[PDB]
Write an enzyme that holds these catalytic residues in place. Structure first.
Site, short mmCIF file in Angstrom:
data_model
loop_
_atom_site.label_atom_id
_atom_site.label_comp_id
_atom_site.label_asym_id
_atom_site.label_seq_id
_atom_site.Cartn_x
_atom_site.Cartn_y
_atom_site.Cartn_z
N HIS A 89 0.78 -1.23 0.00
CA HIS A 89 0.00 0.00 0.00
C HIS A 89 0.82 1.29 0.00
CE1 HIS A 89 -3.89 -2.07 0.85
NE2 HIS A 89 -3.09 -2.94 1.44
N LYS A 130 -8.25 14.14 5.09
CA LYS A 130 -7.35 12.99 5.05
C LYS A 130 -6.42 13.14 6.25
CE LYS A 130 -6.26 14.22 0.85
NZ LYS A 130 -6.18 12.97 0.06
N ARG A 131 -5.72 12.08 6.61
CA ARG A 131 -4.80 12.16 7.74
C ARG A 131 -3.73 13.23 7.47
NH1 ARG A 131 -4.81 7.96 11.87
NH2 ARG A 131 -2.94 9.14 12.50
N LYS A 174 1.15 14.45 2.03
CA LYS A 174 -0.17 14.86 1.53
C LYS A 174 -0.26 16.38 1.30
CE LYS A 174 -2.50 10.89 3.71
NZ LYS A 174 -3.30 10.26 2.62
N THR A 198 -8.16 6.98 -1.79
CA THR A 198 -9.55 6.53 -1.97
C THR A 198 -10.55 7.65 -1.68
OG1 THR A 198 -9.58 5.62 0.28
CG2 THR A 198 -9.14 4.09 -1.54
N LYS A 253 -14.22 8.98 -3.62
CA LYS A 253 -15.45 9.36 -2.92
C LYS A 253 -15.95 10.71 -3.38
CE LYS A 253 -13.57 7.07 1.11
NZ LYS A 253 -12.99 7.30 2.42
#
Ligand SMILES: O=c1c2ccccc2[nH]c2ccc(Nc3ccn([C@@H]4O[C@H](CO)[C@@H](O)[C@H](O)[C@H]4O)c(=O)n3)cc12
Ligand SMILES: O=c1c2ccccc2[nH]c2ccc(Nc3ccn([C@@H]4O[C@H](CO)[C@@H](O)[C@H](O)[C@H]4O)c(=O)n3)cc12
Ligand SMILES: *Cc1c(COP(=O)(O)O)cnc(C)c1O
Ligand SMILES: *Cc1c(COP(=O)(O)O)cnc(C)c1O
Lengths: 807, 807
Positions: A348, A539-540, A545, A647, A651
């Site tokens: 992942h 998101k985390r 990110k 992901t 969404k």
């Protein structure tokens, strides 16, 4: 009310009402005079639960009789969220329960908000597991999710003075109506001890025993009467001064106490290793028991598939070898053949800090027999490498499961590749990166092992459940079949010039935004302009990110307004949410920066309601279900090559937001599906990042050449966003200028220019909505039903089915 | 089958069968193909539980409307045993459930044996509390039992090589269907901190908080549709590195983890003090909340009675004062008046080692405000003493709540007397001893406070439930009214010369003995002669209870047989059972002695089956229900003045055993009720023990004058009963010869001679049985219904009722 929510038959509504009353009386031991909303929630949950059990017993009986190949999905995380509405959706009971509760004088949506999230995961990896269980049930696979029943899930996040505080998530406080304890199927798990050798073979003796008690939770498929099982293990001490000995039972039982709150980051803690072996050991006994109830293990891979969700359950490989060799007395070569054909591994991430490397001394103490087996696996594997690439001694050290150095470690990814017949990444670009970089040597030895399985999301939870308005207007045009066949959304391309459909899509979004704007005032006492562009990054919190890149844009917009107050700009509500791991200092500082920017921007009179910056507290599955349907713009801005898939991106696409993003992870495939002209793509590609790394990344260059960027850094350094503490953000500035692994400055100019194009399009509502329709219409590939069908056919060797079992 | 077990109506049996099937399917999620006996037990338990809830809700609603005076029984122990059969008995469902289960192909008695004892007590004190709850419900009192929900009750006892081993009693492993968690009524409890003084008053600040979560268990009355509540508190940590902080929640939650396994013995451990305050603090908040839902606390004692079961909940006195003074702002004198009129204290022993004396430094640290309140109570109390007995300075030090010395301690018994309007002992002789010895000074100051309430046992559990055969033959002659009016057993005196009744009584005993003899072979692989006299001593292992005196008699019988093998002696099976506290060395040695005697006696060919010595393992409520109905002779042989009452004695009398006993505790009143001619009384009276203490007890004298006693001591010393370890019992011999507080040798001759008279009577079955009938017929006084009626009228100021509530 709406057709997708099913029928409200007179008999069914009558039967639900009486069963509701029965549970309130007999199960909850309450009367209507003293009952609270929570009691009413539980009465409804038990009523809905009753409709599962017949199908649940019947499904498992069906598998026992037909004896299909069983799929075992092993994960340390299942990020399930709430269960009530999902269950009603999958059983077609939503309208009936709405009517039944309405007739009893109750608002069902109010009762749904009482349920705690089952927060047994951190983020993407854990939520993928949950989506996968839903799809496996919907596709009629004999599938079992196996994990740990954490007593405390992911912490509840509070913001105090702009800083994250953690609170324990005591999610079982009021009980969990969905689970069924199965103490009768409790199994022993062994730790420590030592290995002795005999005429027969090796024996693992003098161990400490912890009991694994299973709790079973039903997993209903979409309107096919299939109900599969998620089995989660709980740690119990065996029954054998006196008082202190009883109190010390907590030592054993701590194994299942708490979820480690790390996201995409490895820490080598002993308790975590115990958790990993605990799930593996209990699960494999359960698998073997079920197999023997069908001597001959030749057929084991024909009846069993074990899917390893990351390396966290990697000890399945040597545990299976241990059981087959030491207990069943199979010869090594035969056991290895069975093991390889049984196990498959999903990677992942390529981030080096997320790769599991366990110190040898830890394994030596905790799991001495497994270490011996790992060494033997390594010796035999490296002998194959040596025969294939004679004289290539550096390759031998690169491919070894054992890493040398100050502390010897086992590379669990290498173990997984060696002991699996299939290895997959989770998006096309990621799977290619695996073959070109970190697993290049392994790909050269065994190219056939390497596959791609692009991730997906379940359209039940992530459309029908969270956005019924959108699901309904779609169903009106193309019917309901798309909910279990998402590729049918392509039919919506025929309506891109339909004036009625354009209006309806736009209306649904506006209603969602109004509902969310109200939710914010109610629960968090914060007001927002519902006509503004809803710009969302949830998101985390992670450096890769690049929430920081978003922050730079927000400050840019603020500075531009201050420079030309009376010029028109498209109003925005910028929302950023996510949890930081408790020990991740830089992530905690990023949260503080976001709230600090909000404190300035939200109270500047010259800005007005043209720009608002909100930090969404306690981001979790239930909050995702609220904010995603309300979003206009989805921020997917990781440095190219770092987000394996994503992901959340999928969404947002399904729910009518446009995407601003890098060509990273599944963003690449989303843009390919929708057309690049219908996506806001910016920034370095993976190849550009590589070129920059070769010459060396110098952030100072960007600072020197971009005046707007310079201004922001000066503001941060000087204490503009922290007046009473001027050097508060020095660590952030220092990182950006000298030690930025993720090249925030390198993508700044293109990001800002791309954001201007977003604002330009938002000024033309009709063309915005047409582009949205093109996105929704091409989101079909990103159904987890598609993903699971591919795992089934290409890895597990089983055929999916949409045929319904008899009710 | 039998009339006392109620009706098996066609409709009721049909309804029970369908509800059983419903629970197996929906509640247990099982089908009949995979169900085990345990599943069937749970299906039955839930079915029976359903019949309680209507009555339970209705009872509590009734109390809310009529607002009667509420009785709060505070205990650290409730030794409940099993609940299924008791519930069926009290609801008149036993025959119907027997028929319903029989029609489903199940044996109900087999299913009853699966239920775990709720072993939340040690022995007499804990079991009294349980009997009292049953009687309070049967007499229609608005009564609440309040205690702690221990996760682990009294340990399971295993015998390994003749030695006691302890195993944790994980009684909640499979779930408890009888309880209902009430997380919504969770309350905070405070510990540690410090006291600060203000203009307003004292404030207790900087405390640590532990949450008290209640679990409610129904307590049904006998066929009156009354269902009262037992509320047991469970300790929970409040929700506010990260991982270690979550793991450390166990520290708070350990408060309710385990029952301290001490019986009639005090140890000053901090965790126990926390347990005591925990139950008190949570309970009093609950009491006050319920009272306020009826400003004016003048009426508090008219609406509330608090009964303290021993000194264990004594902190209720200063806690009530704390709440009234510090929180409600009542003046001290008014608060004290309310407190005294509300609280009453029951003393259960005069043994000095059982009296609670807490070190001041412990209270100072844990409960600093309560210590201040205790000092103030003490100063005001001693001022009263000084005014009543001017110049009597020694009386002042004797009566003080604060004991001086190396370590200052608080005498909790003194606190209880000062702060209660009533103080009672538990048998006439005990209550007299209290006034003459340990509480003489207090009796002289406040004679009106001192009462007697002779203990009793519930005839539901201890006759109808455990001995249906006896209950039935009684009912055949005098009807069923005696089950809630045990004085009606006096009517059986009319049948003492009835040849049919004599035969039936004897037949019931023989059947009970056959059933128990079979149970021993099944579960413990041990054979016994069912025609032998069943000589039983079951109770916790203690020096004061003199299991050692029994042992001496057993060895005497053995030696006499060896001396004259071919002489006839009445065959005996001597059974001794009971647990020893884990730290009580001498008690553990006594258990080893008993098994060691068995090892010799049971394998001597010359003895044959004329003498058998069995140690009954794991004595507990469920085992008492089996062995007591099978007993011929009840051993109640404590040193006169040491057993405050006893309650096992009463159980045996009700079930057709004759009693060999000292004039101690309730034995005195039992002999008075039945007639001394129908009791086997021996040994020193209290007055004789006093005389012996005055001149000094010299055991050597008895050794020198009794050759049979000398022989036994020589056998013990020389290693006759421990060949491979000749000095194993040196500590026992040393104790008996030089440091015997309980004068075992002084009662030996009379005990042996009395035992000969027992054997003589047993040779004449008809006269034995006639004496049994005289015992059973006069056991009525020892119903706990009689006891509770007296508490109600003489202490609590409430009237009992046998009127039924509507179903
Ligand atoms: O190493 C640990 C760890 C060590 C000690 C204690 C607890 C731990 N918890 C973890 C939790 C997660 C991870 N690793 C990952 C790796 C990838 N991902 C995400 O997976 C998604 C589903 O494929 C992708 O869409 C996403 O791109 C990826 O970042 C993701 O969400 N967590 C690693 C660890
Ligand atoms: O002091 C403690 C203690 C201290 C620390 C931790 C745990 C503790 N547990 C205890 C449990 C019991 C007792 N005290 C007593 C006192 C009397 N009795 C018995 O009570 C019966 C009912 O009235 C009588 O029939 C019997 O005669 C009496 O011995 C009886 O059964 N336990 C005292 C303690
Ligand atoms: C989907 C989801 C994630 C993953 O989001 P990414 O943007 O792909 O990292 C994380 N947390 C929650 C609660 C989610 O629903
Ligand atoms: C009645 C009972 C006791 C008390 O017995 P005594 O002989 O009065 O000490 C102890 N334990 C159990 C299990 C009981 O049922």
């Amino acid at each position: 009310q709406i057709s997708v929510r099913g029928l409200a038959g007179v008999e069914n509504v009558t039967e639900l009402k009486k069963n509701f009353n029965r549970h309130l009386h007999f199960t909850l031991v309450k009367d209507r005079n003293v009952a609270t909303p929570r009691d009413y929630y539980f009465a409804l949950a038990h009523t809905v639960r009753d409709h599962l059990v017949g199908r649940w017993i019947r499904t498992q009986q069906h598998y026992y009789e037909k004896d299909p190949k069983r799929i075992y999905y092993l994960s340390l995380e299942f990020y399930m969220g709430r269960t009530l509405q999902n269950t009603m959706v999958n059983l077609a009971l939503e309208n009936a329960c709405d009517e039944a509760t309405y007739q009893l004088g109750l608002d069902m949506e109010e009762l749904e908000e009482i349920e705690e999230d089952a927060g047994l995961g951190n983020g993407g990896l854990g939520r993928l597991a949950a989506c996968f269980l839903d799809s496996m049930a919907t596709l009629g696979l004999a599938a079992y999710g196996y994990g740990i029943r954490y007593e405390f899930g992911i912490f509840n996040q509070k913001i105090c003075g702009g800083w994250q505080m953690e609170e324990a998530d005591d999610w079982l406080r009021y009980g969990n109506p969905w689970e069924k304890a199965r103490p009768e199927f409790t199994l022993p798990v062994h730790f420590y001890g030592r290995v002795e050798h005999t005429s027969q073979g090796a024996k693992w003796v003098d161990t400490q025993v912890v009991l694994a008690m299973p709790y079973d939770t039903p997993v209903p498929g979409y309107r096919n009467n299939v109900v599969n099982t998620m089995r989660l293990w709980s740690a119990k001490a065996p029954n054998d001064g006196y008082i202190q000995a009883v109190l010390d039972r907590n030592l054993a039982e701590n194994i299942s106490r708490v979820l480690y709150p790390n996201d995409n980051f490895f820490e080598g803690k002993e308790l975590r290793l115990k958790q990993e072996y605990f799930v593996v050991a209990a699960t494999l006994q359960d698998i073997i028991r079920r197999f023997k109830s069908s001597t001959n293990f030749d057929a084991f891979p024909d009846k069993v598939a074990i899917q390893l969700n990351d390396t966290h359950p990697s000890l399945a490989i040597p545990e299976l070898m241990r059981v087959l060799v030491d207990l069943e007395r199979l010869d090594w070569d035969k056991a290895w053949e069975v093991t390889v054909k049984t196990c498959a591994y999903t990677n992942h991430t390529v981030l080096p800090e997320a790769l599991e490397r366990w110190p040898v001394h830890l394994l030596e103490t905790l799991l001495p027999r497994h270490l011996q087996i790992i060494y033997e696996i390594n010796q035999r594997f490296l002998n194959r490498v040596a025969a294939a690439f004679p004289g290539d001694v550096d390759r031998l050290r690169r491919m070894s499961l054992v890493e040398e150095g100050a502390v010897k470690r086992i590379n669990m990814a290498h173990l997984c590749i060696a002991g699996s017949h299939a290895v997959n990444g989770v998006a096309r670009i990621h799977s290619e990166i695996l073959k070109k970089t970190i697993f290049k040597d392994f790909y050269e030895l065994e190219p056939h092992k390497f596959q791609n399985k692009t991730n997906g999301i379940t359209p039940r939870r992530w459309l029908v459940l969270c956005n019924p308005g959108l699901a309904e207007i779609i169903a009106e045009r193309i019917g309901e079949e798309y909910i279990s066949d998402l590729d049918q959304l392509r039919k919506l391309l025929s309506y891109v010039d339909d004036e009625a459909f354009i209006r309806d899509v736009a209306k649904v979004k506006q209603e969602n935004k109004l509902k969310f704007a109200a939710y914010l005032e109610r629960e968090y006492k914060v007001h927002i302009n519902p006509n503004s562009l809803f710009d969302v990054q949830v998101k985390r919190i992670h450096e890769y990110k690049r929430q920081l890149l978003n922050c730079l844009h927000v400050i840019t917009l603020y500075n531009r307004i201050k420079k030309e107050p009376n010029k028109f700009v498209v109003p925005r509500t910028v929302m950023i949410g996510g949890k930081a791991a408790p020990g991740y200092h830089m992530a905690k500082m990023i949260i503080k920066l976001i709230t600090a920017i909000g404190d300035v921007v939200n109270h500047d009179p010259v800005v007005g309601d043209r720009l608002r910056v909100i930090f969404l507290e306690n981001y979790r599955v239930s909050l995702a279900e609220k904010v995603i349907p309300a979003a206009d713009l989805s921020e997917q801005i990781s440095t190219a090559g770092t987000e394996a898939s994503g992901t959340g991106n999928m969404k947002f696409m399904l729910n009518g937001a446009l995407t601003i993003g890098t060509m990273d992870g599944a963003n690449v495939e989303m843009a390919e599906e929708a057309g690049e002209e219908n996506f806001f793509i910016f920034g370095m590609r993976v190849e550009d990042v590589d070129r920059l790394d070769q010459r060396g990344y110098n952030a100072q260059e960007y600072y020197d050449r971009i005046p707007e960027l310079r201004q922001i850094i000066e503001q941060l350094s000087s204490g503009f966003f922290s007046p009473k503490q001027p050097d508060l953000f020095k660590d952030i500035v220092n990182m950006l200028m000298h030690h930025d692994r993720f090249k925030v400055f390198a993508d700044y100019e293109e990001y800002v220019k791309c954001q201007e194009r977003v604002s330009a399009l938002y000024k033309n509502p009709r063309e915005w909505t047409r582009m949205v329709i093109r996105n929704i219409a091409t989101s079909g590939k990103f159904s987890s039903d598609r993903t699971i069908a591919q795992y089934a056919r290409e890895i597990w060797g089983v055929e999916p089915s949409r045929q319904r079992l008899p009710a």
